[PDB]
């Protein structure tokens, strides 16, 4: 069963990629789509985790699974971060951060005497079917590609 229910009008979002096109979550239907959030582009972090998921695109592929990153960061930032890195597969340019508030990946937290407000480092497995089937918050990056590959080749049976 779904661990997540987005708002109906999240699967039709324009999601502006690294390139220059756009998809929709609605345009994946029918195989399996790995969508993971990270803060910023170029960060140690985030590069991490960027490589790992690229490093194990056959994988994903062999399930016939799909991946998206996604950050608010512009789509310039992206092509230049994935240009750098040799990703091979879209990050997802959320400037509006429509598609981080509807997964809510947006967190507050009372710092510096206010309230300041982040994307929240998370993965999500999205079944052909549009249903959100698992998800990963406050991720840990090291050993995350590897656990969430495991638990799509689990789900995809």
């Known amino acids: ?22 998809t929709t979550l609605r345009a994946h239907a029918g195989h399996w789509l790995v969508i993971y959030f990270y803060p910023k582009d170029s960060t140690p972090g985030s590069t991490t985790e960027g490589l790992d998921f690229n490093a194990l695109l ?22 230049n971060f994935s240009a750098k890195q040799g990703f091979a597969f879209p990050l997802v340019s959320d400037g509006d951060e429509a598609l981080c508030r509807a997964f809510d990946v947006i967190k507050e937290k009372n710092m510096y005497g ?43 049976k």
């Open 114 to 156: 206010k309230q300041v407000l982040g994307i929240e480092r998370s993965t999500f497995l999205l079944s052909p079917e549009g249903q959100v089937v698992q998800a990963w918050r406050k991720v840990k990056v090291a050993g995350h590609a590897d656990a969430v590959l495991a638990a799509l080749k689990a789900h995809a």
């Open 58 to 79: 056959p994988e994903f592929d062999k399930a016939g699974a799909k991946i998206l990153g996604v950050s608010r960061d512009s789509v310039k930032s992206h092509d």
């Open 1 to 22: 069963d779904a661990v997540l229910e987005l708002p109906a009008a999240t699967f039709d979002l324009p999601l502006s990629l690294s390139g220059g096109t756009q």
